[PDB]
RNA sequence: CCGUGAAAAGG
């Protein structure tokens, strides 16, 4: 039979959820890597068990017409651009099949339209924020990427799709902990200091706060390599100290201090200026969250006696842009130093009519619930895990006639919107937008509608 | 799920 490293010619006859290739071989599935569909590949087995196998290109018999390849001393998977090797419009395709696949699979639905992927004018050099490991390698320290799958990392310098300057403050950070050898962290044997650099930068603004990520309170000469780089990059107005000292692998800790500077940067998203903290979450593609945000607001209809609420809200970038052309905002948020954001870039932008509290979106809903409050329309944009069953039952409760459902994965999304179909609301549209090109992550926005009066 | 383009291990 089939065993490890065995050779065998296939064809690829379709892309996995991942990007992945599939080939079937003698009843059994393989998945393989940087192999797209109609290419004909020799194939190394890397493993099989009964049913599904994985294997390697050894040689490309014939390549797709689709095939990026052409570009370029890759930027050769590393874990950044798993769909790098696809043309663009075949990545849009692709996305747009994800959307529609996982809609009926999960949620049943077959039928709603599902537009295609709106997608990037330029779809490169994108990302306004870097988190970038720190590690041992070859005797010498080393900012880098994980290869899938591991934590085994891969020096680099370019990283393809990151605005060019995060990388060019990633490396002078590298040069500058050379020089004052300060001790990268060690999973194993569980030692060093410097576990992360964490690099966000304003799209509009230019303003770039810089994160280092350590494993204890004390960094000797800290102020010293703060001097180097704030030379280097006058636009830096922030620079964060984040300690964690335990074995995990979230990146960030419990504490935070500020070493230089401010605890935000400034950026503008729809004309609106807001401040963001190092721990908050901001969209990291900012051109195509401003077409994500603005497609959120033609689903949803908004009139001036409307009343949103803006759960898992963040910084209130959604809340805030809405808050003009309606009657009240009212907007939930987990971590505090983003809800501080909330209130205070609601003051920047003079907005009296946006409400926002810290509580888990559940309790505030209990609250808002009692409280006499009666929404119209619901704005979620949740995390990967999506919304929990006591989420969604609330927020059906309210009455409000409108969700709009902004989501970062579609096998979530439609577990949550089956959910709402049998609280009586019917799934009306869905938009995919690409915030993430050459990564086979699609975000996607759905428009939920009341039928039922209940 | 902790867990955030990649994100082992361990819960
Ligand atoms: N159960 C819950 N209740 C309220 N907020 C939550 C939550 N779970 C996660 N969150 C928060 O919801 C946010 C999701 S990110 C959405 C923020 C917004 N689009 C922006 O651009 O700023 C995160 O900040 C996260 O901490
Ligand atoms: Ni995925």
Avoid at 21 to 47: C, H, Q, T, W
Avoid at 75 to 81: D, P
Avoid at 374 to 400: C, H, M, N, W
Wanted: charged content about 25%; hydrophobic content about 40%; proline content about 4%.
């Amino acid at each position: 039979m089939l065993k490890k490293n065995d050779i065998v010619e296939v064809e690829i006859v379709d892309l996995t959820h991942e990007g992945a290739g599939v080939a079937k071989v003698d009843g059994l599935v393989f998945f393989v890597e940087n192999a797209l569909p109609s290419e004909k590949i020799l194939m190394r087995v890397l493993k099989v068990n009964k049913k599904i196998g994985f294997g390697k290109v050894e040689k490309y018999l014939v390549q797709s017409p689709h095939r990026n390849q052409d570009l370029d001393l890759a930027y050769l998977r590393s874990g950044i651009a798993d769909l790098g090797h696809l043309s663009y419009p075949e990545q849009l395709k692709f996305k747009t099949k994800q959307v529609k696949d996982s809609l009926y699979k999960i949620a049943g639905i077959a039928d709603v339209e599902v537009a295609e992927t709106l997608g990037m004018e330029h779809p490169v050099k994108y990302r306004n924020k870097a988190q970038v490991p720190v590690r041992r390698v070859n005797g010498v320290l080393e900012t880098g990427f994980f290869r899938k799958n591991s934590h085994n990392l891969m020096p680099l310098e370019d990283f393809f799709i990151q605005d060019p300057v995060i990388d060019q403050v990633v490396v002078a950070l590298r040069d500058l902990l050379r020089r004052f050898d300060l001790k990268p962290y060690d999973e194993k044997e569980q030692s060093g200091l410097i576990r992360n650099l964490v690099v966000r930068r304003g799209h509009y603004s230019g303003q770039i706060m810089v994160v280092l990520v350590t494993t204890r309170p004390k960094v000797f000469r800290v102020d010293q390599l703060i001097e180097q780089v704030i030379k280097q990059f006058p636009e830096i107005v922030s620079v964060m100290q984040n300690i964690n000292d335990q074995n995990t692998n979230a990146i960030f800790g419990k504490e935070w201090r500020t070493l230089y500077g401010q605890d935000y940067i400034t950026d503008q998203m729809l004309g609106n200026d807001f401040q963001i903290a190092g721990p908050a979450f901001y969209q990291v593609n900012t051109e195509m969250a401003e077409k994500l945000y603005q497609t959120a607001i033609d689903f949803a209809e908004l009139k001036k006696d409307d009343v949103i609420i803006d759960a898992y809200s963040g910084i209130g970038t959604i809340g805030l842009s809405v808050a003009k052309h309606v009657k009240e905002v009212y907007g939930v948020e987990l971590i505090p130093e983003a809800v501080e954001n909330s209130q205070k870039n609601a003051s920047l932008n003079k907005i009296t009519n946006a409400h926002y509290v810290c509580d888990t979106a559940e309790n505030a809903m209990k609250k808002w619930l009692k409280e006499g409050i009666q929404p119209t329309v619901i704005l979620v944009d949740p995390p990967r895990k999506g919304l929990t069953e006591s989420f969604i039952k609330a927020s059906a409760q309210t009455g409000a006639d409108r969700i709009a459902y902004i989501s970062c994965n579609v096998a979530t999304m439609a577990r949550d919107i089956k959910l709402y179909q049998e609280l009586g609301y019917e799934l009306k549209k869905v938009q995919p937008v690409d915030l993430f090109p050459q990564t086979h992550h699609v975000q996607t926005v759905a428009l939920l509608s009341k039928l039922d009066v209940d």
